[PDB]
Amino acid sequence: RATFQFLPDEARSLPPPKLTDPRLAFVGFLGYCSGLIDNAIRRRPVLLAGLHRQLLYITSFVFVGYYLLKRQDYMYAVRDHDMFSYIKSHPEDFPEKDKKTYGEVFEEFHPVR
Amino acid sequence: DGPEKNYERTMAILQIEAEKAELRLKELEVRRLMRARGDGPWFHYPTIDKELIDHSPKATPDN
Amino acid sequence: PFFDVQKRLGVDLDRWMTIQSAEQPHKIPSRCHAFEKEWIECAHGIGSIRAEKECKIEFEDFRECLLRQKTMKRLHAIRRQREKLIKEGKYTPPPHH
Amino acid sequence: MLKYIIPTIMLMPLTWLSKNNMIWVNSTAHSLLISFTSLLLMNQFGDNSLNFSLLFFSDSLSTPLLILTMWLLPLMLMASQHHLSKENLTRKKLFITMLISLQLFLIMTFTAMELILFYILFEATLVPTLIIITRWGNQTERLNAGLYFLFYTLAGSLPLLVALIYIQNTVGSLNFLMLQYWVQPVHNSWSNVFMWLACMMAFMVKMPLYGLHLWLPKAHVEAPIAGSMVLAAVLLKLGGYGMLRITLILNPMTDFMAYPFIMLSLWGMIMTSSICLRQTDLKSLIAYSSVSHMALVIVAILIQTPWSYMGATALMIAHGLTSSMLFCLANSNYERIHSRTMILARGLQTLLPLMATWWLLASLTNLALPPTINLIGELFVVMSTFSWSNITIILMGVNMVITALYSLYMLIMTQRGKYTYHINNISPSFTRENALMSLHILPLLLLTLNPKIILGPLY
Amino acid sequence: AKTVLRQYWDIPEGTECHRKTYATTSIGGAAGLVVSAYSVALKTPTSFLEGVARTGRYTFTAAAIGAIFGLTSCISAQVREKPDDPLNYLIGGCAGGLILGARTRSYGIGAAACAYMGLTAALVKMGQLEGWQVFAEPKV
Amino acid sequence: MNPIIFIIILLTIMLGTIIVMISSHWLLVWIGFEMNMLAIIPIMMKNHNPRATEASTKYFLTQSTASMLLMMAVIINLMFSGQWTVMKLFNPMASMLMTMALAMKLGMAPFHFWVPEVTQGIPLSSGLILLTWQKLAPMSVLYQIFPSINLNLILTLSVLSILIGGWGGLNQTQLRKIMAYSSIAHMGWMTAVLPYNPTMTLLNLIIYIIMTSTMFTMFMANSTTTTLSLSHTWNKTPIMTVLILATLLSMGGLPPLSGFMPKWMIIQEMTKNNSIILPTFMAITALLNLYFYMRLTYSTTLTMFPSTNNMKMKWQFPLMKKMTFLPTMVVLSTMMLPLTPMLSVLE
Amino acid sequence: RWQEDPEPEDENLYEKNPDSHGYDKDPAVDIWNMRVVFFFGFSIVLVLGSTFVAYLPDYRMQEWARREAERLVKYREAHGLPIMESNCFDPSKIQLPE
Numbered sequence A: 001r002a003t004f005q006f007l008p009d010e011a012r013s014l015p016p017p018k019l020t021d022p023r024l025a026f027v028g029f030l031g032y033c034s035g036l037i038d039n040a041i042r043r044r045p046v047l048l049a050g051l052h053r054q055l056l057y058i059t060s061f062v063f064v065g066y067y068l069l070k071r072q073d074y075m076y077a078v079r080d081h082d083m084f085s086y087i088k089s090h091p092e093d094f095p096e097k098d099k100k101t102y103g104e105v106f107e108e109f110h111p112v113r
Numbered sequence B: 001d002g003p004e005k006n007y008e009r010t011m012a013i014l015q016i017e018a019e020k021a022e023l024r025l026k027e028l029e030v031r032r033l034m035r036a037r038g039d040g041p042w043f044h045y046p047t048i049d050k051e052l053i054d055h056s057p058k059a060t061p062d063n
Numbered sequence C: 001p002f003f004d005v006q007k008r009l010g011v012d013l014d015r016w017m018t019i020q021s022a023e024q025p026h027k028i029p030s031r032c033h034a035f036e037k038e039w040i041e042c043a044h045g046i047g048s049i050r051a052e053k054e055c056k057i058e059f060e061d062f063r064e065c066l067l068r069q070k071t072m073k074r075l076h077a078i079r080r081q082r083e084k085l086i087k088e089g090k091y092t093p094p095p096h097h
Numbered sequence D: 001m002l003k004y005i006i007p008t009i010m011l012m013p014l015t016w017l018s019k020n021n022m023i024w025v026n027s028t029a030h031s032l033l034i035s036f037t038s039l040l041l042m043n044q045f046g047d048n049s050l051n052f053s054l055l056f057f058s059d060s061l062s063t064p065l066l067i068l069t070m071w072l073l074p075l076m077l078m079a080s081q082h083h084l085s086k087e088n089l090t091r092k093k094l095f096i097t098m099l100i101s102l103q104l105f106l107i108m109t110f111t112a113m114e115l116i117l118f119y120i121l122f123e124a125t126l127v128p129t130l131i132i133i134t135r136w137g138n139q140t141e142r143l144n145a146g147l148y149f150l151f152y153t154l155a156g157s158l159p160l161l162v163a164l165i166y167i168q169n170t171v172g173s174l175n176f177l178m179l180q181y182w183v184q185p186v187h188n189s190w191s192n193v194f195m196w197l198a199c200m201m202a203f204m205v206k207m208p209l210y211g212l213h214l215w216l217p218k219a220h221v222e223a224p225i226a227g228s229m230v231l232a233a234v235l236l237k238l239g240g241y242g243m244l245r246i247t248l249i250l251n252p253m254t255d256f257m258a259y260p261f262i263m264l265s266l267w268g269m270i271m272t273s274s275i276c277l278r279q280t281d282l283k284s285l286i287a288y289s290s291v292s293h294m295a296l297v298i299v300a301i302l303i304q305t306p307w308s309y310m311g312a313t314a315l316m317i318a319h320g321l322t323s324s325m326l327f328c329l330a331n332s333n334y335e336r337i338h339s340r341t342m343i344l345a346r347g348l349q350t351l352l353p354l355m356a357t358w359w360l361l362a363s364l365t366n367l368a369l370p371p372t373i374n375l376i377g378e379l380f381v382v383m384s385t386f387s388w389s390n391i392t393i394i395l396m397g398v399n400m401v402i403t404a405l406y407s408l409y410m411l412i413m414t415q416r417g418k419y420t421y422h423i424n425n426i427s428p429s430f431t432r433e434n435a436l437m438s439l440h441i442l443p444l445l446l447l448t449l450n451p452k453i454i455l456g457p458l459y
Numbered sequence E: 001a002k003t004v005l006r007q008y009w010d011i012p013e014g015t016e017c018h019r020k021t022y023a024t025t026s027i028g029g030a031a032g033l034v035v036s037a038y039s040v041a042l043k044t045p046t047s048f049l050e051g052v053a054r055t056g057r058y059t060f061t062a063a064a065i066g067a068i069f070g071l072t073s074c075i076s077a078q079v080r081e082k083p084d085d086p087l088n089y090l091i092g093g094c095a096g097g098l099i100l101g102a103r104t105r106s107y108g109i110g111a112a113a114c115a116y117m118g119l120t121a122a123l124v125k126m127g128q129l130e131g132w133q134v135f136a137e138p139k140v
Numbered sequence F: 001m002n003p004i005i006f007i008i009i010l011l012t013i014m015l016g017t018i019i020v021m022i023s024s025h026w027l028l029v030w031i032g033f034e035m036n037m038l039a040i041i042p043i044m045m046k047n048h049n050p051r052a053t054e055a056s057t058k059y060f061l062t063q064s065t066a067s068m069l070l071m072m073a074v075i076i077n078l079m080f081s082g083q084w085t086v087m088k089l090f091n092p093m094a095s096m097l098m099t100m101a102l103a104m105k106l107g108m109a110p111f112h113f114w115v116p117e118v119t120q121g122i123p124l125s126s127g128l129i130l131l132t133w134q135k136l137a138p139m140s141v142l143y144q145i146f147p148s149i150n151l152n153l154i155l156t157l158s159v160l161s162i163l164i165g166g167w168g169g170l171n172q173t174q175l176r177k178i179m180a181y182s183s184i185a186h187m188g189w190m191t192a193v194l195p196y197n198p199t200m201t202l203l204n205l206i207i208y209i210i211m212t213s214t215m216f217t218m219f220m221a222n223s224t225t226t227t228l229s230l231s232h233t234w235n236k237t238p239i240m241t242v243l244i245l246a247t248l249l250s251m252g253g254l255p256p257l258s259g260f261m262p263k264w265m266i267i268q269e270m271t272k273n274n275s276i277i278l279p280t281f282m283a284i285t286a287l288l289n290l291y292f293y294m295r296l297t298y299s300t301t302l303t304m305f306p307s308t309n310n311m312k313m314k315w316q317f318p319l320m321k322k323m324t325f326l327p328t329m330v331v332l333s334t335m336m337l338p339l340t341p342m343l344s345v346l347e
Numbered sequence G: 001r002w003q004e005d006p007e008p009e010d011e012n013l014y015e016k017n018p019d020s021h022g023y024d025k026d027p028a029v030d031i032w033n034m035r036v037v038f039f040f041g042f043s044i045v046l047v048l049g050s051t052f053v054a055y056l057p058d059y060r061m062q063e064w065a066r067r068e069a070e071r072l073v074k075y076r077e078a079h080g081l082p083i084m085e086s087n088c089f090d091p092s093k094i095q096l097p098e
């Protein structure tokens, strides 16, 4: 809602992503893969070389991914808050139907002969 | 798994997918109305901010 | 703006020159100052989709002030009707005109 | 499904971390262990499918296909490790990784509860399949075969993507359980005629439908043996499985939209059976055999009867094991003489007596000798198409005759007669080759004792 | 183009064929001219006369395809007394493809044109009947 | 070029783009484009050869022409509204001129002719800036003026760009000309969905930039500019051939790779608006892009092309190129599909 | 032409290892590869899997349905009711159009 803000203040009333979020685990995995590719293109032992470098790949991805996931969750909360409030403001456009049962509704039968 | 667990796990799955399905339909109709009438948070294309206007007395009166 | 850094930082880079009813040097007003003020205040905050229909009167008057197309049509008609009567010998302008 | 997805992924660390000389032993052993545990999917109920989560479910249709898929991975590893012996070590591990990733996409494809999740995995199988064909095929034409395989599939899939997304918009969901209850009838209109075509053409190309099948003989003749095994056994069945699910929401329009495709299949099956009588290439003969068999599956899915759906389900499983066996049998000859020409090496029953038994058993299942599940599937389809229209027994009858002629012609030409004099490198069959053949035919013949577990949801 | 397109769709199918053929010819001729203009601009003619020759060759070929489709589609509808049947445009579409094939002295082009133009024209009539939108107005 | 001068010129390329994206005034938007055009030309001429001179000249004439049409639209807009705010325009003639002006700046068809030639005539590092960073400013303007853009005009440009990009790349052996026609093809997808959902234009733009940066970085790593020169890569660095394969399949839009994501979300938005024929036509025509991506994968990774004897000398030296961010970019180019719902960050 | 390696000859695994199973050139690896294929393929999956399938509990409730049908026929025939009515659903719960 706030102009050119990555995370408006109201976003703090939502629960933050857990640090065991499955989406966050995937992002951390992508950082691990990036670390491996870095060793491979530079012709270093892929698994062993530069564990300090590999750690920072995992850490940076998880750090950025945590905030992206938080904004992602925030934008979907905002979408629903907007959508439900609009429905409340315009009842005549979203009228509750009278729900007929299947014993009353006539559906045509199409034999598979 | 016993039939009862799978049976009632299915009802839980169907509830979530039915609720999501209804919201998907509702969002399409809300989007249709908001865009056509411009009376909601979405499709709110900016107009000139009125705080830019200067209301001070001018060099001439008729303005 | 695509990125509203001006709002985030509260710095005015270019919006001081966006409209003619903004603050001018020595409070010199534009010719259509009142018309644009009325249009801007009518359409403020409701969005273009609504402003296109709900502020049509203000925008049309503002457009008339800017380009004066309806006035020039009106004056072109009177001037034409005068030459129609001058040649036909049906009207003598007054001394003051 | 995570009890199968995760151990399937763990096959990749296992292969890459294995000692240089144990990559085949380790991957083969542990992929067999995964195959063992897949039998737990047979906890099926009379009324309800087995629904694990919001993402994955397993009914009686997907369960046998999943078990076929996971059984095939160890067989493909056994079948490839000979011609990949001289391969670079890393390029051997990349080959195995392509097969493991294909199994991963496949078992998720058969259990996706949402159709757009099914679409992505259904499409994802292209990449590993294409890379196998074009990287590890032997001939120049493997490059053209890759392109035909890729663009035939995509020509159909991309319309399917539009149709599914349109269906989600109007219905609100693509969850297959939800579609069962929210399905509405399809009323005639040019708009629905093309919705029907978009929903069915992607699957028709995979089967393949006669006329749209040209990609298949190309791909088989150029693919490596493991590629041909998965192509025939499973990837063709993605078309059948997809059709069996999507036809739910195409009623009653399927009544008249089926006619052009039943005509193509009923006539196409006689045409492709007769092509087999004059094929000079053994792999190409088996490829064209699949087209004829899968024509029956297309007809059965389109006439939409309880007997035809049971027959289609059995045919897909039976064909999967038989066609995979036949490709493996032809490959063992190829690894010796290095040609696919059927008439090149003759009278092999004299030189390889036990491999000639496998050739016999494979042929008998291919011609549908009762009570094999090949015959159970083919018979159930013929019963239902007879009720659809009595005259279909004429076309079914002729196909059965021609199917026997080319099945035994392949047996007689390669195994009987006199051996070719100048061919003198026919070594005795290896244990690996004999075990590979028996791991095809024994489960195929065992399923005759208990055929209900491959008859599908309408049993 | 909107004015000529509207005229074609405002006279009912199967009625007043001459008027229809003028509309399809007008559309065809304009398409041929557009092709000539880019062709002359991007592949300079050796002489002014030739550039005129190329222009007339394309504009006539395009106009012929338009006239024959408009003639065939209207006459087939009137004869068959089926004004709103997509099949009429399929007959008109293929006939146009044949004219293109004749003007090119290539049977294979004529064969392919009669097909793809046949399907495309029949697809247009269904779109008109069912309201298929190509450039669909934004809505949601 | 002095290294300090190169950095100052690069930062001016970015400053001009930034000015366009933060300006609320049409005059400052025009200034941003002019400042950006001034700074990029010396990057094109950096190697000083006749092809660089021809490329820069063709670029200058095209961009300078577009700016005059851009300023014409702004002044017409001023006459008919009396303001300069960056938003919808108040005159249809102004909207057309501005829309064409931005189409020429992006190199959309039929204003596309400069893109293949300019890209071929400048180094790879300069080509990377041209086909990536230079798209930001014109797209950021379209993102703000779309409510007044003529739908038939913008969809016509999008259709022609996808066709001409797809067909144009089929006949190319030069890598820089292959990237150029690919860029034209991808520009069409971005503008095709702009009338319906500008958020999907940004997604396509971001993913296109990541994939395009990845490819250019890999071409720079090996100093390859032709198909045959790139076909020697399997003999120098085998790993780089696998990254090229994965990236190229991604640019083709194949699931489950990231490049499928924008094609997928654009088709969703178009169908929600009852646009069925256009997305179908667009998806099928994008198979042309997949075709000439697949040729590169064949000659690069899935076969082994003949090598030369002197290639053995290169085995004894390591890669010295910076290859900045390539490990990150390639992973993003390929393994992002599971995170598609993150597109709401762009909302 | 070019400088190319000639096509290598065919290696017969039996020449070096007359007891080869066709899995590996190393005899010890070749034996282990055979052992895992046979033990895990035949002894486990095929033998135990076949036994597991044979003793599946009432796969898709076919036996329960037969027991249930017996219960219904016994009841209905004793009470004189039809074995099976043509109407699946109670007609009092249906409201026809018109």
Ligand SMILES: CCCCCCCCCCCCCCCCCC(=O)OC[C@H](COP(=O)(O)OCCN)OC(=O)CCCCCCCCCCCCCCCCC
Pocket (backbone or CB within 6 Å): A033, A036, A037, A040, A044, A045, A046, A047, A048, D009, D010, D012, D013, D016, D090, D097, D101, D104, F239
């Ligand atoms: C829980 C984990 C599950 C695994 C999921 C894998 C998903 C794909 C991840 C892609 C990123 C892989 C890492 C980047 C490649 C670097 C590895 C390499 O270049 O060569 C292999 C290398 C061993 O060879 P070497 O170069 O000598 O290094 C010595 C170190 N032992 O290093 C090694 O020892 C092996 C390193 C991994 C090899 C990966 C091989 C390519 C995999 C891509 C195929 C597509 C993935 C499957 C698709 C479905 C995705 C689930």
Ligand SMILES: CCCCCCCCCCCCCCCCCC(=O)OC[C@H](COP(=O)(O)OCCN)OC(=O)CCCCCCCCCCCCCCCCC
Pocket (backbone or CB within 6 Å): A027, A030, A038, A052, A053, A054, A056, A057, A060, A061, A063, A064, A065, A068, F323, F324, F325, F326, F328, F339
């Ligand atoms: C959308 C959802 C998915 C989320 C995507 C998230 C992507 C964004 C996350 C950032 C991506 C880049 C992360 C790169 C991590 C590797 C950094 C590293 O290990 O560097 C090792 C070393 C330089 O490290 P050093 O500069 O000394 O550390 C201090 C940094 N201020 O020296 C080296 O050898 C580095 C050389 C290899 C790196 C390539 C060249 C780039 C140079 C980067 C410099 C360091 C940047 C520090 C990154 C911090 C990011 C939080």
Ligand SMILES: CCCCCCCCCCCCCCCCCC(=O)OC[C@H](COP(=O)(O)OCCN)OC(=O)CCCCCCCCCCCCCCCCC
Pocket (backbone or CB within 6 Å): A040, D090, D091, D094, D127, D128, D131, D135, F237, F238, F239, F240, F241, F242, F243, F245, F246, F249, F256, F257, F301, F302, F330, F331, F334, F335, F336, F337, F338
């Ligand atoms: C995760 C969920 C989302 C799913 C999306 C898909 C995820 C996968 C994304 C992949 C990202 C790219 C990174 C792939 C890592 C590949 C590792 C690898 O290929 O091994 C390295 C090796 C390079 O050689 P080298 O470093 O010198 O080691 C000694 C051998 N000479 O390589 C070689 O030597 C091979 C040289 C021969 C070339 C063989 C090419 C065929 C094998 C290609 C497999 C990878 C295909 C990836 C495409 C997508 C697959 C789905």
Ligand SMILES: CCCCCCCCCCCCO[C@@H]1O[C@H](CO)[C@@H](O[C@H]2O[C@H](CO)[C@@H](O)[C@H](O)[C@H]2O)[C@H](O)[C@H]1O
Pocket (backbone or CB within 6 Å): D188, D189, D190, D193, D257, D260, E084, E085, E086, E129, E130
């Ligand atoms: C492999 C390709 C297979 C191709 C299979 C071809 C199947 C052909 C199906 C033709 C029937 C289509 O369905 C038919 O469409 C038209 C749409 O205009 C509907 O009819 C509608 O349009 C017609 C105009 O022609 C009007 O006269 C009618 O009043 C209106 O309701 C019909 O109610 C419907 O019966």
Ligand SMILES: CCCCCCCCCCCCO[C@@H]1O[C@H](CO)[C@@H](O[C@H]2O[C@H](CO)[C@@H](O)[C@H](O)[C@H]2O)[C@H](O)[C@H]1O
Pocket (backbone or CB within 6 Å): E024, E027, E028, E031, E032, E035, E057, E058, E061, E062, E065, E066, E069, E070, E103, E104, E105
């Ligand atoms: C309902 C409205 C129907 C409108 C129909 C519109 C049809 C589309 C027409 C497009 C313009 C004609 O298209 C153009 O025709 C000429 C025919 O000479 C072709 O020209 C080709 O054939 C002949 C003989 O070879 C020569 O003209 C020319 O040397 C050759 O290139 C062009 O290659 C083609 O691009």
Ligand SMILES: CCCCCCCCCCCCO[C@@H]1O[C@H](CO)[C@@H](O[C@H]2O[C@H](CO)[C@@H](O)[C@H](O)[C@H]2O)[C@H](O)[C@H]1O
Pocket (backbone or CB within 6 Å): E005, E006, E009, E010, E120, E123, E124, E125, E126, E127, E128, E129, E130, E131, E132, E133, E134, F277, F281
């Ligand atoms: C190579 C293949 C290229 C892609 C081929 C795709 C074919 C798609 C068919 C085009 C779309 C249908 O074609 C278009 O439909 C609309 C309806 O919305 C028609 O719209 C028409 O409806 C009314 C009648 O009700 C007419 O009086 C009016 O002139 C017009 O608005 C157009 O006259 C027609 O041109």
Ligand SMILES: CCCCCCCCCCCCO[C@@H]1O[C@H](CO)[C@@H](O[C@H]2O[C@H](CO)[C@@H](O)[C@H](O)[C@H]2O)[C@H](O)[C@H]1O
Pocket (backbone or CB within 6 Å): D019, D021, D022, D025, D026, D029, D033, G026, G028, G029, G032, G036
């Ligand atoms: C529930 C999960 C069960 C998983 C079961 C997986 C079964 C896998 C069976 C492979 C067993 C082979 O175990 C094997 O043992 C010996 C002794 O340690 C190892 O070491 C051996 O290498 C070579 C074989 O090439 C021998 O000649 C040598 O005598 C010995 O050093 C092998 O490297 C190892 O491969």
Ligand SMILES: N=C(N)NC(=N)NCCc1ccc(I)c(Cl)c1
Pocket (backbone or CB within 6 Å): A075, A076, A078, A079, B031, B042, B043, E140, F196, F197, F198, F199, F344, F347
């Ligand atoms: N279609 C457009 N032009 N705008 C647009 N994205 N409308 C859709 C409305 C929407 C969707 C998701 C979210 I999260 C939010 Cl907050 C709002």
